[PDB]
């Protein structure tokens, strides 16, 4: 392959290993800074900060496309991108407590934005529209992703173990330090310099206008939050829940029908991303406190996810040598993944404590629903940011008591919308 995809699957291994790092053990973080009395809010908050951190990452990364490509430029943009993820897991690492959630929070959601869909530009901008090597490449790319997302709640789990939350959070900043020095000292090597400056620039004092009316507007609305008492941080979550949603709704005879006979499609992929990204949030919940793991930090329970896609992935591509039908079968799988940890708490309650192998179950059927599941590429963000929103209203209801009803109504009402869906084919 080019030299350029050494330095580039080296540099998304090294983001992917920061990020679901960080995220493998930031829920259990918050859990511990509420005990401590740093953070007050429920558990049920807590979770809740952890569903809309994803997804406003995910709502970030549809417009750091539009910045590269317009404004910095795809290079620079994943470089300082990564210095803001950097500067992201620096602020949690210092022995501050919920100061640094936010300011890092934000940082990483900035930084992120910046660098997603940006790395993935640039892996297409190693090959020439005709190089034949680029569907090999691009699997090469992901592997280094799941790769690095596999090894990162083993190694960032067991460091908080160990030695505590501070240095596992620190582990993630190395991480993330490393992938920028690989990128910038390999970058010089391998990779184009026309992609030092945006490719498509009387549209600039515009773009400043339409930048600022929807942050002006954005201000404004925290104001009278303020005003009406709606102050509260889960009212400030409704206002980034709000905004999610409200950016797809607000997105002839034979013309009209298609662009709404994406709609049950978009749904699919939403409500699909709900539940996959509920793995590192309510499942987190129910790996600590409904299973028996002794020998290994619970955290690792985050691992099977990109196992599964690692193993998955040579399979179904010997396999594929419709589409509505896929995002169907694939919607039930994740209803199905949900209806199987309904099983282990309905027949023995939810008192006690269950078998590991529950989780790799479920995981196993999501990824295998997730097997099935630049215009598309930012739709696909959002349908993940609006599944990550949906999950910031939802995990606030998962609790002991409603752990059996959650999987089973939300996993059975997954299906039904999937049996819908097939259907509407």
Known sequence: QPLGLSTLFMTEMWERFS??????????????????GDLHITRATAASIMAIYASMVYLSGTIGGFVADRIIGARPAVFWGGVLIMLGHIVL???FGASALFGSIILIIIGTGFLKPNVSTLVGTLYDEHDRRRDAGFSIFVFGINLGAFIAPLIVGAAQEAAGYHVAFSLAAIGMFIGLLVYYFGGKKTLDPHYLRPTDPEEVKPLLVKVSLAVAGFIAIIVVMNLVGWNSLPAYINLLTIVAIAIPVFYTSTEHLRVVSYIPLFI????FWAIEEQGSVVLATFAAERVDSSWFPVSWFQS???????????????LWTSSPTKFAVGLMFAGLSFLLMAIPGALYGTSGKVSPLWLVG????????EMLISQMMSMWFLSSSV?????????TLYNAKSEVAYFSYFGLGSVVLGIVLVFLS
């Open 387 to 395: 599944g990550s929103a949906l999950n910031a209203q939802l995990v």
């Open 304 to 318: 099977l996810n990109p196992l599964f896609i690692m193993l998955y992935t040579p399979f179904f591509a010997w």
């Open 93 to 95: 690492a210092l022995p």
């Open 268 to 271: 699919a992929a939403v409500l």
């Open 19 to 36: 990020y679901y790092g960080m995220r493998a053990i930031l829920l259990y973080y918050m859990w511990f800074l509420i005990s401590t």
């Open 362 to 369: 479920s995981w196993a059927l999501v990824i295998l629903g």
